Amino acid sequence: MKYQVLTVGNPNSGKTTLFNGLTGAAGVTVEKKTGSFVHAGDEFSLTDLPGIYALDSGNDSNSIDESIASRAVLTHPADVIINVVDATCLERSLYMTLQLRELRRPMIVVLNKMDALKRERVHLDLKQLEAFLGCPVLALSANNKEQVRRFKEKLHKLLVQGIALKQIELHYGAEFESLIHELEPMFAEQAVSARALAIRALENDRLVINGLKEAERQNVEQRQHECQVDIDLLVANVRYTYLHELCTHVRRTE
Ligand SMILES: [Mg+2]
Ligand SMILES: [Mg+2]
């Protein structure tokens, strides 16, 4: 059975290096490479998504690479999404990981360059990271082809066994959570989390909004204005707080 795998991550996070090591052999050719490798009589079509720092659609140009990647994660179905994070800049790369896990999609966090972090006298509790994120957090180094081969086996087992996904608990605020629950039913029948789609709708992500009827569009529009706090400010603040406490727990100074 053929399995669709999406490799997404920050630019220069090792996301590209993993894809080339695994698969061997468009209009966004910056970071749109499709590859294939076979393991245990099953095929693995991989799509290297452009390196991005956050999720955002475009049509405004200068953001085509980002728009392509954001669109794929939100529409293009995939059996698992390999999110590569560079341990050296841990906090920076986790912003997309938070948005990714919010989608409630099969996810595998692959921590890269863990060896370099040891040299900086920084140690990481990968196990504690797995508990907070609720998704498989695997650690390797994409440079090591030996470790890359070991990763193929872990992925195949994980894909067949099923990816256990413990929903991330965020609680932006009852003020925001009330609005989210009111828009959740519109996105029930999707491929991504209905909750996440409403949050993106409340952030005025036109990509999600354009799939809405004009009437439902006006209903969503009104919710943005009938707020005592700016949606963008509130969402960003909650996301930052979670990231900071997460990093301070799993990290260790010497
Ligand atoms: Mg109200
Ligand atoms: Mg209109």
Numbering used by the authors: 1 to 25, 33 to 261
From the paper:
FeoA and FeoC are known to be small (ca. 7–10 kDa) cytosolic proteins, while FeoB is a large (ca. 80–100 kDa) polytopic transmembrane protein that contains an N-terminal soluble G-protein-like domain termed NFeoB. The status of GTP and GDP bound to the NFeoB region is hypothesized to control the opening and closing of the FeoB pore and therefore the translocation of Fe2+ into the bacterial cytosol.
First, regarding AEX, we monitored the 260 nm/280 nm ratio through the entire chromatography process, and noted a normal value of ≈0.6, indicating that VcNFeoB(His)6 does not co-purify with nucleotide, unlike previous reports of E. coli NFeoB overproduced in E. coli. Second, SEC of either crudely purified VcNFeoB(His)6 (IMAC only) or polished VcNFeoB(His)6 (after SEC) showed only the presence of a dominant monomeric species in solution, consistent with our previous in vitro studies on Feo proteins (from V. cholerae and others) recombinantly produced in E. coli.
